């Protein structure tokens, strides 16, 4: 039939908002209604189980010798409080919103235009050794978990955001993504964050190459929708030249 502009609609029962992830009571209420994802423990930093030459005034922009090596400045930066290269320390995350997708579960979207190489969010979680990782892989497989939340930090340390993390756990995989991870040194400790790899317009889902599952043994249908989607996520090997 003939379509028309819908009337204004105001919700009766109040809206669930991003600040509600820092309000356990309201989040648990929202989750019962399917208005927010299943509760998890929101953490501010990972749980474990260098002076640039910038002139004091962008403060520590693209030419900063720390930034170029993916090292954050300290409080002793020549730019002091105005240093722009302390984004993980100051939790200077992008304006993001959590969305419910048709096929992949929840996801993250940009709420403003994000230029290329914008810091989105730190990927926080429990940092596991190989023994704890192997135990939890078996635990989650036995539990028939639908979603995975592991990401390698270093050759002997895997971050697990299944139980504890932040909204970066909702990032979905795309075969043609608009974000990547970068591993930065902050006060001598490696931390990992999501960064855009192109300009991402306001309203766009943020996506990345989920390497942990992509090169894992088992596979699942890929719902990314990309023009050149590889069809499934998982069961792939990186390029090699054999014999
Ligand atoms: C950032 C790191 O923690 C990984 N984040 C989860 C997001 C789960 C979130 N959606 C939810 O609802 O909590 C990855 C899982 O999401 C699924 N997912 C993603 N992108 C898919 C695709 N393109 N096709 C199918 N499933 C896909 C899959 O289960 C993956 O392990
Ligand atoms: Zn600098
Ligand atoms: Zn600085
Ligand atoms: Zn795909």
Swiss-Prot record:
The entry marks the following residues as binding Zn(2+) 2, namely 60, 73, 77, 83
All residue ranges annotated as the SET domain in the record? 94-211
Q: Which amino acids does the record list as binding Zn(2+) 3?
A: 175, 222, 224, 229
Localization of this protein: Nucleus; Chromosome
Annotated region described as Interaction with TUBA1A, given as residue ranges: 1-243
Instruction: Provide the tissue specificity.
Output: Ubiquitously expressed.
* Effect annotated for changing residue 133 to A: Strongly reduced methyltransferase activity
Q: Which residues form the Post-SET domain?
A: 218-234
Q: What is the effect of changing residue 198 to Q?
A: In ALL; uncertain significance; somatic mutation
Impact noted for substituting residue 180 to A:
Increased methyltransferase activity
The listed outcome for residue 175 to A is: Does not affect methyltransferase activity
Give the recorded effect for residue 20 to N. Answer: In ALL; uncertain significance; somatic mutation
Record's comment on post-translational modification: May be automethylated.
Where in this chain does the record put each AWS domain?
A: 50-92
The annotated consequence of residue 153 to P reads: In ALL; uncertain significance; somatic mutation
Annotated residues that bind S-adenosyl-L-methionine are located at 104-106, 147-149, 172-173, 220, 223
Positions carrying Phosphoserine are 240
Positions of Zn(2+) 1 binding? 52, 54, 60, 64
The reported effect of residue 214 to A/V/L/I/F is: Impaired methyltransferase activity
Task: Cite the record's note on assembly.
Answer: Specifically interacts with hyperphosphorylated C-terminal domain (CTD) of RNA polymerase II large subunit (POLR2A): binds to CTD heptad repeats doubly phosphorylated on 'Ser-2' and 'Ser-5' of each heptad. Interacts with HTT. Interacts with IWS1. Interacts with p53/TP53; leading to regulate p53/TP53 target genes. Component of a complex with HNRNPL. Interacts with TUBA1A; the interaction is independent on alpha-tubulin acetylation on 'Lys-40'. Interacts with STAT1.
Q: What is the role of this chain?
A: Histone methyltransferase that specifically trimethylates 'Lys-36' of histone H3 (H3K36me3) using dimethylated 'Lys-36' (H3K36me2) as substrate. It is capable of trimethylating unmethylated H3K36 (H3K36me0) in vitro. Represents the main enzyme generating H3K36me3, a specific tag for epigenetic transcriptional activation. Plays a role in chromatin structure modulation during elongation by coordinating recruitment of the FACT complex and by interacting with hyperphosphorylated POLR2A. (Microbial infection) Recruited to the promoters of adenovirus 12 E1A gene in case of infection, possibly leading to regulate its expression.
The UniProt family comment states:
Belongs to the class V-like SAM-binding methyltransferase superfamily. Histone-lysine methyltransferase family. SET2 subfamily.
Associated pathology:
Renal cell carcinoma: Renal cell carcinoma is a heterogeneous group of sporadic or hereditary carcinoma derived from cells of the proximal renal tubular epithelium. It is subclassified into clear cell renal carcinoma (non-papillary carcinoma), papillary renal cell carcinoma, chromophobe renal cell carcinoma, collecting duct carcinoma with medullary carcinoma of the kidney, and unclassified renal cell carcinoma. Clear cell renal cell carcinoma is the most common subtype.
Domain statement: The low charge region mediates the transcriptional activation activity. The catalytic SET domain binds histone H3. It is also able to bind oncogenic histone H3 K36M/I found in a number of cancer types, in which histone H3 'Lys-36' is replaced by a Met or an Ile residue. When binding the oncogenic variant histone H3 K36M/I, the SET domain undergoes dramatic conformational change to accommodate the histone H3 peptide, leading to sequester and inhibit SETD2 activity and block global H3K36 methylation.
> What is the protein name stated in its UniProt record?
Histone-lysine N-methyltransferase SETD2
Organism of origin: Homo sapiens (Human)
Gene name for this UniProt entry:
SETD2
Q: Which residues of the full protein are shown?
A: 1434 to 1699 of 2564
